[PDB]
């Protein structure tokens, strides 16, 4: 019928006639069966989409302008202009402020659209999770299909970031470097080529990121997610 | 198991289990604290 | 034993004797099985436990064992009125004894053949203790010289 | 119905001869549940057609490339090379895994609901006309050999599929027992049938105890314990 | 009615193990939960045993997988001495008493829920710790605790058949994990190696590596 | 007692028994032919005590048990 995550199948119960953008009748485990839980999961999905979009775009642009640096270790070897403890504290304070405001918007919409400084500036009434106003200056057409575009690009970017970190853990190099490693040898650079388990032998690709990395005196156990369960 | 527990609550079963647990407690007391002639604190 | 005597199987006829097949390790062992006899007995115990317990519950309730799911195999476990004669789609797959008198005649055939086989199994055990050789070998030796090779003529050498 | 698998067998009630291949079998009673019965007919169709493809492949490979045994034809060193790309068995397994996963999920969704995934995923204007389950047609029937008499052709397909299943079981057992090809085994039986039969040939597993495939060890087996 | 632990056979215990409890297949040959109060107590014990054994078996499996991967992770049967050797500043009595006290707090919370199903959803705890009931027909307390804290994803609020399916999942997985821990203990006793070690030893060599070849189960082979 | 053969292998074959009691070389043949006097090595009747142990002769106990078993079955 309509657009579905599995053509020919039907929507569940909680997803019948979705108001959320990018609804394709998924949720096999029924995580969104509850009402307010579905709204909380929608907000978490939207911020996950946007954060992963930012992350994938940042990794790609950092590699285009600087191919010699490795994004997985970029947090330890980048030469910060400022000290890291004060930087982390500044981020914690300001992001605590903004995320508390966003979360309390999700708890109740008409509660904090107002500038705490200036009484004249205030966001207009909006659907939860879509602030707009100052946050949305320029809109290319109607809002609904562009929201669908945003959410679909966000799903793609979350999958992209997971692929990025797995390429970094398996190959030890950049995901565009991993791309150019896969194109010249398509039959051999696949994970099926380098990782086969059979009842009698298990072949696991070696981990490239060092288990312990030293950073300003201390050591961080940034190993390789977890081994053992690797195919 | 109401009737079984009532049988376990009967006087001979309860007195045998009680003297068993009391004797075992005293025996393990003498096992870990032997030759206690006096109550020296 | 009749296959080893003909040479069709690559088993020595002294080894192809039934009690030397690993049923009694003191009486003889066959170490070429794909597992040791204890593992085979473990899985045999599980499988016989399945089969004989379902058979027992069908004996106790002569309508059960078809109401509970068994990977679709419960359809042939209805049985009949007689516990000894289920005869469903599996137990009577070829459908023989269509008419009751033929069924009774074939039942008599089965019971007579089986009681003859009970006598034969007891005899095979007694010959195995008596002669330390296979039943087919005992038959061949008796047919060679019946006067000398009998129960009274083998009464001296019995476990040697 | 008419003639059954045995001269005296009573047909099951659910085996009324309505659909293709009915010879009054099922001694297990696996066909009592109609839902599981349709599932098992789907499994029979898939297994029969795959057995046809496998048996035809073995026969054609033996008559065209007799120097290569079909049992060991999956080895990387026996794989014929068509280009300069290195051979990697995970590379082939990725292509087949993805493609067969797609097509088998499509077939599974068709099995779950009759008339479910008939339309093209891009343009939903032209579809496949399946008359019943397991029989898609359309592009799968481009030469138009159905349409007219469909029941006898269906029984032809299912009986040839059963024959191909039995033939592939024969091929596997013969390959494990004799270590040679099937048509070569038939030729050997024409020469010395009194020594090249299932006697003596059985009880020996000509399969090696293992195999190494570019550093990967596969333990292998030969269906029955006999060496 | 329902699928029993022994197909056919209608001597299944009288109508206290009717087809109402989750996981009910009529299995009580010894009558250890015949009285209704003991039945409710044993339902609490079974759910708690299933959840605890599931957590323990998952931990054992993960630590055994990590041990085969070369990580600095001990096996489950020796993790206590390994922890004491790696951390000599911890007193054994200290850690044991701390475990007793912290476990006792939440276990007395659960106990006073068992005594009174509605008494733990007030006072210091919020209304989410009231419980949702389930067994024996009650709609409060019991082994199943709803709320946004013990069901933060809310997978049994809404769609009752989803709740029933998930409860059946939980009880079947809990019984399976209890038998799994029993197997872990027996395999450690009879072999001296870990569970994953035993599994990959049997997968590598299907034959000559069964339970009869360890010399403990069969005590002469 | 460590190097003494186990009871079953004494029971298993009449060879070791014939080494210890020579009447087992002929087996059950003198029993069914009623030449029971050849079983006199292990079916004895001396009386008194075994001087090694001070107990009764075990062959005498065997003969006793066989005789009373026949009497009781009668
Ligand atoms: C953590 C990120 C996240 C979150 C919060 C959501 C949340 C939501 N998604 Mg979404 N989704 C995501 C990621 C996420 N998604 C990604 C990456 C993809 C691409 C594969 C999709 C593709 C997708 C589709 C096609 C649809 C949804 C839909 C929905 C909504 C209903 C489903 C539901 O109620 O369950 C809530 C889901 C969660 C609470 C996430 C739980 C995460 C678990 C606990 C971790 C397990 C990870 C799992 C094993 C995968 C490993 C990650 C990686 C290896 C791939 C819901 C608000 C449906 C909808 O109606 O749209 C509005 C729908 O049609 N999602
Ligand atoms: C009423 C007469 C009497 C008295 C006063 C005592 C007194 C004593 N006996 Mg003795 N005894 C007696 C009769 C008596 N016995 C008899 C009749 C027998 C023959 C069965 C024995 C055989 C006997 C043996 C074999 C031993 C003693 C020992 C002891 C001493 C151990 C104290 C102790 O257990 O630690 C303190 C106990 C506690 C703090 C526990 C008190 C709290 C409990 C749990 C309450 C129990 C509830 C009821 C103690 C001074 C032991 C010893 O070493 O002698 C020096 C010892 O070896 N007694
Ligand atoms: C010669 C011995 C003998 C005889 C005369 C019978 C006779 C009978 N059996 Mg019985 N049975 C036997 C041995 C025998 N059985 C043994 C050894 C077992 C243990 C495995 C069984 C177990 C058994 C069960 C569980 C049942 C019967 C039933 C029956 C009755 C059904 C009618 C029938 O099909 O007859 C049998 C016909 C013959 C014996 C002649 C054919 C002999 C050929 C040479 C052997 C066929 C084997 C074949 C080569 C293997 C493949 C079979 C097929 C796929 C080709 C019938 C009266 C059923 C019943 O009671 O119906 C109500 C039923 O429930 N039998
Ligand atoms: C995997 C293959 C397969 C499958 C799924 C089916 C499925 C089905 N068959 Mg079919 N059949 C097959 C193979 C198969 N068959 C072969 C090879 C033959 C030729 C001997 C036949 C001959 C046949 C006839 C004559 C009839 C059926 C019928 C049926 C239908 C009802 C039977 C039933 O319910 O049991 C379901 C069956 C299964 C679930 C398969 C289980 C396989 C077991 C577990 C393995 C057994 C191993 C086997 C003995 C060894 C084979 C190798 C050997 C040759 C050396 C059903 C949908 C009836 C029908 O057409 O209905 C209308 C009927 O009349 N079949
Ligand atoms: C049906 C009864 C039966 C049973 C239980 C066995 C059992 C066994 N046979 Mg045997 N065999 C049989 C009949 C049987 N056979 C017949 C009738 C023949 C003549 C063709 C043979 C010829 C034969 C040979 C040449 C060998 C065995 C061997 C073996 C052993 C290994 C399994 C194997 O590979 O053999 C093959 C399995 C079969 C032949 C089963 C087919 C029988 C019917 C068709 C199905 C049942 C095994 C314990 C091997 C051995 O001795 O170990 C060293 C061996 O080399 N068998
Ligand atoms: C200690 C864990 C535990 C507990 C408390 C329960 C409790 C309960 N079970 Mg359950 N069960 C368990 C484990 C447990 N089970 C496991 C591991 C399995 C999988 C094998 C099952 C499978 C099962 C089924 C299929 C069913 C039940 C059912 C029941 C309920 C009624 C039975 C009853 O009243 O007897 C009370 C039980 C006990 C008092 C515990 C028995 C412990 C004994 C006394 C020790 C000996 C057993 C031990 C295995 C022997 C080895 C010990 C040692 C040598 C290693 C009841 C609430 C029935 C039900 O209606 O579900 C609600 C039912 O259908 N159980
Ligand atoms: C209640 C769950 C539980 C279980 C099943 C075990 C089981 C085990 N522990 Mg352990 N332990 C536990 C809780 C538990 N522990 C807790 C809460 C602490 C305090 C943090 C410890 C601290 C601890 C230490 C320091 C040691 C063990 C050790 C051991 C192992 C051998 C002990 C022994 O030989 O005697 C038999 C044990 C039992 C019969 C357990 C039954 C008793 C509980 C209450 C059930 C064994 C497999 C030893 C080890 O590492 O092995 C080499 C070791 O020295 N444990
Ligand atoms: C340890 C035994 C303690 C069992 C608990 C008390 C049994 C109560 C019960 O089962 O109900 C009676 C129950 C009748 O139900 P009622 O209406 O409660 O009397 O009897 C039964 O059906 C089962 C009796 C089995 C008793 C097992 C005895 C021990 C077996 C050990 C085998 C060796
Ligand atoms: C839907 C559902 C429902 C049902 O029922 C169930 C299930 C199935 C479970 C589900 C789910 C699924 C899934 C897939 C999920 C996932 C998610 C994700 C992936 C997220 C991520 C997400 C992700 C994310 C955020 C990410 C982010 C990232 C970032 C920011 C990055 C950053 C960075 C950069 C720039 C660069 C530098 O130098 C460094 C760093 C710092 C590194
Ligand atoms: C059920 C059914 C139903 C469906 O539908 C159909 C069908 C399939 C037909 C079916 C089946 C059937 C069957 C299984 C049958 C079988 C039988 C048998 C095996 C018999 C034997 C049977 C067997 C028998 C009698 C045996 C006998 C034996 C004998 C006499 C022996 C003798 C002897 C001895 C003492 C020793 C010496 O030194 C030698 C000799 C001379 C050698
Ligand atoms: C009917 C019934 C019913 C009742 O109720 C029960 C009973 C009695 C059980 C029954 C019976 C059944 C049966 C007989 C079954 C069988 C089946 C089969 C055999 C299958 C196969 C099936 C088979 C199949 C698929 C196969 C396929 C094959 C293939 C793909 C192959 C491929 C290939 C080739 C080309 C060559 C290369 O170089 C390699 C390879 C790779 C090797």
């Amino acid at each position: 019928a309509r657009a579905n995550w599995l053509p020919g199948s039907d929507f569940p119960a909680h997803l019948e006639n979705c108001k959320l953008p990018g609804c394709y009748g998924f949720d096999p485990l029924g995580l969104g069966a509850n009402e307010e839980r579905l709204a909380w999961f929608a907000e978490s999905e939207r911020v996950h989409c946007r954060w992963a979009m930012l992350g994938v775009a940042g990794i790609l642009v950092q590699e285009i302008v600087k191919p010699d640096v490795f994004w997985y270790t970029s947090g330890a070897t980048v030469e910060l202009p400022f000290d890291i403890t004060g930087l982390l504290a500044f981020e914690l304070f300001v992001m605590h402020w903004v995320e508390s405001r966003r979360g309390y918007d999700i708890k109740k919409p008409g509660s904090m659209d107002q500038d705490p400084i200036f009484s004249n500036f205030k966001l207009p009434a909006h659907e939860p999770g879509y602030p707009g106003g100052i946050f949305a200056p320029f809109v290319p057409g109607s809002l609904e299909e562009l929201k669908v575009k945003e959410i679909k690009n966000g799903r793609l970017a979350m999958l992209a970031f997971i692929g990025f970190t797995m390429a970094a853990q398996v190959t030890g190099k950049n995901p565009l470097a991993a791309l150019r490693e896969h194109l010249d040898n398509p039959l051999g650079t696949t994970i099926f080529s380098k990782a086969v388990v059979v009842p009698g032998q298990a072949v696991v690709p070696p981990c490239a990121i060092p288990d312990t990395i030293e950073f300003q005196g201390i050591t961080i156990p940034a190993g390789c997610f977890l081994h053992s369960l690797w195919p | 198991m109401k009737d079984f527990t009532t049988y376990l609550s009967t006087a001979p079963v309860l007195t045998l289990l009680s003297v068993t647990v009391v004797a075992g407690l005293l025996i393990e007391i003498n096992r870990f604290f032997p030759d206690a002639l006096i109550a020296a604190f | 034993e009749i296959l080893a005597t003909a040479g069709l199987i690559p088993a020595t006829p002294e080894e192809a004797v039934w009690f030397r097949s690993g049923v009694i390790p003191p009486a003889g062992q066959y170490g070429k099985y794909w597992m040791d006899p204890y593992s085979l007995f473990w899985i045999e115990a599980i499988l016989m436990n399945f089969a004989e317990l379902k058979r027992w519950q069908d004996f106790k309730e002569p309508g059960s064992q078809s109401k509970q799911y068994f990977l679709g195999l419960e359809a042939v476990f209805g049985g009949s009125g007689n516990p000894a004669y289920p005869g469903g789609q599996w137990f009577n797959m070829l459908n023989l004894g269509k008419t009751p008198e033929e069924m009774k005649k074939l039942q008599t055939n089965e019971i007579r053949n089986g009681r003859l086989a009970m006598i034969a199994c007891l005899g095979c055990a007694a010959q195995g203790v008596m002669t330390q050789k296979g039943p087919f070998a005992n038959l061949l030796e008796h047919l060679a010289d019946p006067v000398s090779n009998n129960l009274l003529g083998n009464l001296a050498t019995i476990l040697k | 119905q008419r003639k059954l698998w045995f001269p005296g067998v009573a047909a099951p009630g659910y085996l009324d001869g309505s659909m293709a291949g009915d010879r009054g079998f099922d001694p297990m009673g696996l066909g009592a549940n109609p839902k599981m019965m349709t599932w098992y007919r789907q499994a029979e169709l898939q297994n029969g057609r795959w057995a046809m493809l496998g048996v035809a492949g073995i026969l054609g490979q033996e008559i065209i490339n007799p120097a290569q045994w079909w049992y060991t034809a999956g080895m990387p060193e026996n794989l014929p090379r068509f280009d300069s790309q290195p051979v990697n068995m995970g590379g082939i397994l990725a292509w087949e895994f993805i493609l067969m996963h797609f097509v088998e999920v499509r077939r599974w969704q068709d099995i779950r609901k009759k008339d479910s995934v008939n339309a093209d995923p891009f343009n939903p204007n032209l579809k496949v006309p399946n008359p019943e389950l397991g029989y898609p047609g359309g592009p799968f029937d481009p030469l138009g050999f159905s349409k007219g008499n469909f029941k006898e052709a269906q029984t032809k397909e299912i009986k040839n599929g059963r024959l191909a299943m039995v033939a592939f079981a024969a091929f596997t057992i013969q390959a494990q027992a004799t270590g040679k090809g099937p048509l070569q085994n038939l030729t050997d039986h024409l020469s010395a049938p009194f020594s090249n039969n299932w006697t003596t040939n059985i009880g020996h597993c000509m399969v090696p105890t293992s195999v190494d495939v570019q550093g990967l060890t596969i333990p292998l087996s030969c269906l029955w314990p006999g060496q | 009615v329902r699928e029993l632990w022994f197909p056919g056979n209608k001597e299944v215990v009288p109508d206290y193990l009717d087809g109402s409890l989750v996981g009910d297949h009529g299995f009580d040959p010894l009558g250890l939960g015949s009285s209704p109060e003991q039945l409710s107590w044993n339902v609490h014990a079974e759910i708690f045993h299933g959840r605890l054994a599931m957590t323990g078996v998952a931990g054992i499996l993960l630590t055994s997988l990590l041990h085969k991967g070369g990580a600095d992770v001990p096996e489950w049967f020796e993790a206590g001495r390994v922890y004491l050797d790696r951390n000599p500043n911890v007193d054994f009595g200290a850690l044991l008493f701390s475990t007793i006290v912290m476990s006792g707090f939440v276990e007395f919370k659960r106990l006073n829920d068992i005594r009174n199903p509605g008494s733990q959803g007030s006072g210091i705890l919020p209304e989410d710790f009231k419980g949702v009931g389930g067994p024996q027909g009650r709609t409060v307390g019991g082994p199943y605790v709803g709320g946004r804290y013990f069901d933060p994803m809310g997978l049994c609020r809404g769609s009752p058949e989803q709740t029933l399916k998930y409860k059946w999942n939980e009880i079947r997985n809990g019984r399976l994990a209890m038998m799994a821990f029993l197997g872990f203990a027996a395999q450690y006793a009879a072999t001296g190696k870990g569970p994953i070690d035993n599994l990959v030893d049997h997968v590598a060599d299907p034959f000559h590596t069964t339970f009869v070849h360890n010399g403990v189960s069969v005590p002469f082979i | 007692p460590k190097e003494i053969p186990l009871p079953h292998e004494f029971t298993l074959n009449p060879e070791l028994m014939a080494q210890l009691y020579p009447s087992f070389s002929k087996g059950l043949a003198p029993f069914f032919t009623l030449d029971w006097a050849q079983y006199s090595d292990f079916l004895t009747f001396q009386g008194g005590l075994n001087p090694v142990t001070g107990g009764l002769w075990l062959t005498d106990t065997v003969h006793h048990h066989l005789a009373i078993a026949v009497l009781f079955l009668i």
Side-chain angles (χ1 to χ4, degrees):
Chain A
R2 63 181 295 171
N4 199 278
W5 88 279
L6 204 68
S9 78
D10 62 358
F11 274 44
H14 39 280
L15 305 173
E16 290 286 337
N17 189 359
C18 280
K19 65 178 72 66
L20 303 180
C23 172
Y24 302 108
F26 199 46
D27 208 0
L29 300 175
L31 313 186
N34 199 255
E35 186 66 31
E36 59 90 17
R37 291 280 92 201
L38 191 48
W40 195 249
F41 292 158
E43 181 65 26
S44 66
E45 187 192 22
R46 287 174 298 215
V47 297
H48 271 104
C49 281
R50 289 151 179 174
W51 277 130
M53 277 200 259
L54 276 180
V56 173
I59 289 166
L60 290 174
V61 178
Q62 276 161 245
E63 293 179 354
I64 292 310
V65 307
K66 291 169 195 36
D68 300 334
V69 65
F70 182 58
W71 75 266
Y72 200 96
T73 63
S74 61
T77 54
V78 65
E79 291 291 330
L80 303 162
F82 307 142
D83 195 72
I84 186 163
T85 49
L87 173 70
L88 181 53
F90 167 80
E91 183 178 0
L92 271 192
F93 275 122
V94 300
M95 185 64 72
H96 180 284
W97 173 270
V98 307
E99 289 292 275
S100 186
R101 297 283 300 216
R102 170 182 72 79
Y104 281 136
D105 172 324
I106 302 311
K107 298 291 180 68
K108 39 180 74 171
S111 64
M112 47 183 55
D113 300 271
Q114 184 81 262
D115 195 330
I117 312 294
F118 292 164
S119 75
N120 53 3
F121 287 143
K122 151 150 177 176
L123 272 191
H126 62 87
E127 69 275 16
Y130 298 99
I134 178 177
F135 285 109
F138 154 76
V139 185
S142 83
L143 183 63
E144 182 68 33
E145 78 266 15
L146 200 63
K147 265 153 98 185
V148 176
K149 288 181 185 284
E150 176 203 28
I151 205 78
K152 282 172 77 143
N153 278 260
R155 277 73 172 270
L156 203 45
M158 293 182 286
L159 296 183
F161 178 77
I162 300 303
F164 277 14
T165 182
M166 295 296 172
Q169 284 191 179
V170 167
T171 57
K173 65 178 72 66
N174 278 351
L176 295 169
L179 183 63
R180 86 181 78 194
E181 167 169 89
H182 178 66
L183 276 296
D184 49 351
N185 191 38
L187 295 156
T189 46
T190 72
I191 190 167
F192 275 25
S193 79
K194 71 172 75 71
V196 189
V197 189
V198 291
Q201 187 194 357
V203 172
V204 185
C207 50
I209 292 145
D211 296 338
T212 61
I213 309 182
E214 294 87 1
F215 171 70
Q216 309 183 322
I218 80 163
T219 183
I220 294 93
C224 193
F225 186 46
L226 61 83
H227 193 261
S228 80
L229 283 173
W230 266 27
Chain B
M1 183 179 72
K2 187 269 183 182
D3 297 297
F4 183 69
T5 45
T6 309
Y7 160 68
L8 293 175
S9 307
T10 312
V13 178
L14 272 189
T15 188
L16 266 295
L17 272 44
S18 70
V19 65
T20 292
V21 298
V22 162
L25 183 63
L26 290 165
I27 279 154
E28 303 281 13
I29 277 162
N30 296 115
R31 171 149 89 83
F32 289 105
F33 311 97
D35 313 322
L37 189 49
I38 60 160
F41 280 18
Chain C
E1 184 178 1
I2 212 169
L3 286 193
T5 310
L8 302 182
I9 61 170
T12 317
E14 294 293 328
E15 172 95 353
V17 180
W18 61 269
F19 53 81
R20 288 202 262 275
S21 76
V23 62
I24 312 174
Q29 282 263 45
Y30 189 89
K32 310 299 164 177
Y33 296 127
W34 55 287
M35 294 183 287
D36 65 326
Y38 289 95
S39 299
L40 288 162
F41 171 69
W42 167 262
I43 57 174
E44 158 197 342
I46 286 170
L47 291 202
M48 293 309 285
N49 211 21
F50 291 164
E52 299 287 288
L53 275 180
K54 290 187 78 72
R55 193 174 62 76
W56 161 264
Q57 198 36 62
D58 182 73
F59 169 77
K60 301 298 281 317
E61 294 293 328
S64 63
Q65 304 308 299
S66 279
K67 310 293 163 283
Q68 196 155 317
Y69 181 73
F70 202 67
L71 294 175
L73 275 300
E74 71 274 343
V76 307
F77 295 151
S80 294
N82 205 317
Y85 308 103
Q89 270 186 351
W90 174 265
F91 298 122
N92 201 0
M93 45 168 73
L94 304 188
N95 197 328
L96 294 174
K98 266 77 71 180
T99 313
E101 69 275 16
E102 293 179 353
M103 171 60 183
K104 177 81 178 297
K105 190 255 179 184
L106 290 172
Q107 273 177 344
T108 304
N109 273 120
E110 177 180 14
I111 190 167
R112 258 196 192 109
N113 286 283
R115 297 191 283 213
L116 170 62
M118 270 184 289
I119 291 145
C121 282
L122 181 59
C124 287
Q127 293 179 177
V129 185
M130 204 56 197
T131 59
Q132 309 295 299
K133 291 174 70 175
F136 196 52
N138 298 147
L139 166 66
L140 287 185
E141 294 293 328
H142 191 67
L143 282 181
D145 197 0
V147 183
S148 66
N149 314 114
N150 50 85
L151 188 153
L152 322 168
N154 302 148
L155 194 61
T157 73
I158 56 181
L159 281 181
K160 49 174 74 72
Chain D
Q1 273 289 282
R2 195 36 69 205
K3 183 59 68 179
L4 282 72
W5 72 281
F6 199 74
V9 65
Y14 49 90
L15 289 195
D16 60 350
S18 57
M19 66 182 180
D22 201 299
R23 304 296 181 264
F25 204 50
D26 193 31
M28 295 296 172
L30 290 154
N33 199 13
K35 183 178 184 293
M36 212 66 201
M37 171 69 143
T38 61
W39 175 262
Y40 285 152
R41 177 45 65 109
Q42 287 318 296
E44 188 184 1
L45 275 176
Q46 295 298 109
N47 276 270
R49 289 153 175 175
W50 276 122
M52 293 180 183
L53 281 182
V55 164
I58 296 162
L59 289 189
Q61 186 266 322
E62 203 173 11
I63 66 164
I64 297 169
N65 186 15
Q68 178 52 59
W69 192 27
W70 75 268
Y71 182 76
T72 61
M75 293 180 183
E77 64 265 21
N78 290 318
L79 188 153
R81 210 56 55 81
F82 292 165
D83 48 309
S84 193
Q85 298 305 309
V87 60
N88 199 316
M89 295 300 291
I92 294 96
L93 192 63
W95 267 109
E96 181 212 317
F97 162 68
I98 287 296
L99 269 56
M100 293 292 303
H101 180 90
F102 177 79
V103 306
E104 288 303 277
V105 162
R106 287 294 285 203
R107 202 179 48 80
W108 171 64
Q109 197 47 62
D110 171 80
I111 286 176
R112 288 214 301 189
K113 292 181 181 179
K114 177 59 171 58
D115 285 348
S116 197
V117 286
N118 292 3
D120 181 280
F122 303 144
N123 47 358
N125 259 338
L126 73 165
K127 65 179 73 174
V128 287
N130 62 186
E132 69 275 16
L133 199 62
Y135 295 95
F140 305 100
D141 203 341
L143 300 191
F145 291 15
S146 172
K147 275 78 178 175
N149 198 353
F150 193 52
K151 298 293 183 182
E152 61 95 23
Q154 260 185 341
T155 61
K156 278 176 169 170
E157 182 204 39
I158 198 79
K159 286 210 305 202
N160 274 285
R162 295 152 169 179
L163 191 46
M165 293 179 184
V166 170
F168 189 80
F171 286 179
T172 318
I173 297 289
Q174 282 180 21
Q176 290 157 347
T178 65
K180 292 181 181 179
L183 289 174
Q184 200 275 339
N185 279 310
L186 165 68
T187 288
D188 278 339
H189 201 61
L190 297 191
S191 293
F194 275 76
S195 49
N196 293 314
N197 81 294
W198 73 293
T199 300
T200 70
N201 268 329
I202 208 163
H204 294 88
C205 274
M206 311 287 260
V207 176
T209 48
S210 190
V211 73
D212 188 286
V213 297
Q214 318 184 14
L216 188 66
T217 293
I218 282 162
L220 299 181
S221 191
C222 50
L223 276 187
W224 75 95
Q227 198 176 359
Chain E
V1 192
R2 75 207 176 269
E3 319 196 301
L4 297 166
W5 78 279
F6 183 76
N9 189 359
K10 291 316 174 194
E11 62 93 25
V12 169
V13 287
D15 268 345
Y16 65 88
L17 281 193
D18 48 329
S20 67
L21 287 168
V22 187
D24 201 315
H25 302 280
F27 181 57
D28 202 351
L30 271 76
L32 293 172
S34 73
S35 57
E37 293 83 3
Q38 183 75 12
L39 184 54
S40 83
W41 178 269
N42 286 357
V43 172
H44 290 86
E46 186 184 7
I47 295 294
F48 202 84
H49 276 93
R51 285 157 176 181
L52 181 60
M54 270 192 279
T55 299
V57 161
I60 287 170
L61 286 178
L62 195 147
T63 60
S64 306
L65 288 170
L66 287 191
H67 196 84
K68 293 213 76 63
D72 48 330
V73 166
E75 291 291 328
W76 72 271
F77 38 79
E78 58 188 349
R81 282 180 69 185
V82 165
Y83 170 75
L84 292 184
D85 297 343
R86 293 180 181 177
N87 296 114
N89 63 6
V90 181
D91 196 276
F92 165 75
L95 191 54
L96 185 55
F97 180 77
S98 189
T99 296
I100 290 300
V101 162
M102 292 180 183
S103 65
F105 191 79
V106 306
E107 282 307 280
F108 262 85
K109 296 306 277 182
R110 212 179 43 102
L111 180 53
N112 284 93
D113 177 53
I114 285 169
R115 302 166 168 174
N116 297 324
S119 62
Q120 300 313 287
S122 70
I124 59 155
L125 276 299
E127 294 294 328
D128 284 314
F129 284 79
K130 186 180 289 293
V132 299
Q136 267 66 60
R138 47 160 168 75
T139 79
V140 58
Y144 299 126
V145 186
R148 203 177 63 189
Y149 300 137
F150 285 165
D151 197 11
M153 308 198 84
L155 260 63
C156 292
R157 292 188 296 272
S159 179
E161 81 278 352
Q162 184 178 182
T163 295
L164 187 68
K165 181 246 185 184
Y166 274 134
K167 281 179 180 176
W168 272 96
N169 282 125
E170 185 197 41
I171 191 67
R172 284 185 181 131
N173 276 270
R175 295 163 168 173
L176 177 71
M178 275 178 267
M179 302 298 288
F181 185 80
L182 187 57
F184 289 171
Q187 286 173 179
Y188 171 55
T191 302
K193 293 179 73 174
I196 292 316
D197 291 331
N198 287 312
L199 175 71
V200 298
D201 199 50
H202 197 250
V203 168
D205 203 19
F207 322 95
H208 311 90
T209 61
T210 43
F211 68 98
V212 298
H213 289 91
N214 51 48
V216 179
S217 306
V218 159
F220 42 84
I221 284 298
Chain F
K2 316 214 289 303
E3 66 261 15
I4 289 183
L6 294 173
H8 57 86
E9 66 180 87
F10 270 131
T11 315
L12 261 183
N13 57 339
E15 294 296 325
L16 298 193
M17 212 69 192
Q19 326 189 357
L20 285 186
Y21 296 92
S23 62
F24 271 76
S25 66
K26 62 188 72 176
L28 280 183
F31 177 93
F32 288 85
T33 59
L34 282 71
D35 194 18
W36 298 354
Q38 322 210 55
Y39 286 154
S40 292
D41 51 349
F42 74 100
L43 285 158
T44 72
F45 182 76
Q46 291 83 17
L49 305 171
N50 189 359
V52 182
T53 69
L56 295 172
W57 293 94
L58 286 189
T59 65
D60 289 354
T61 71
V62 159
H63 197 191
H64 151 76
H65 287 119
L66 174 50
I68 62 170
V70 170
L71 190 71
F72 292 164
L73 281 154
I74 294 318

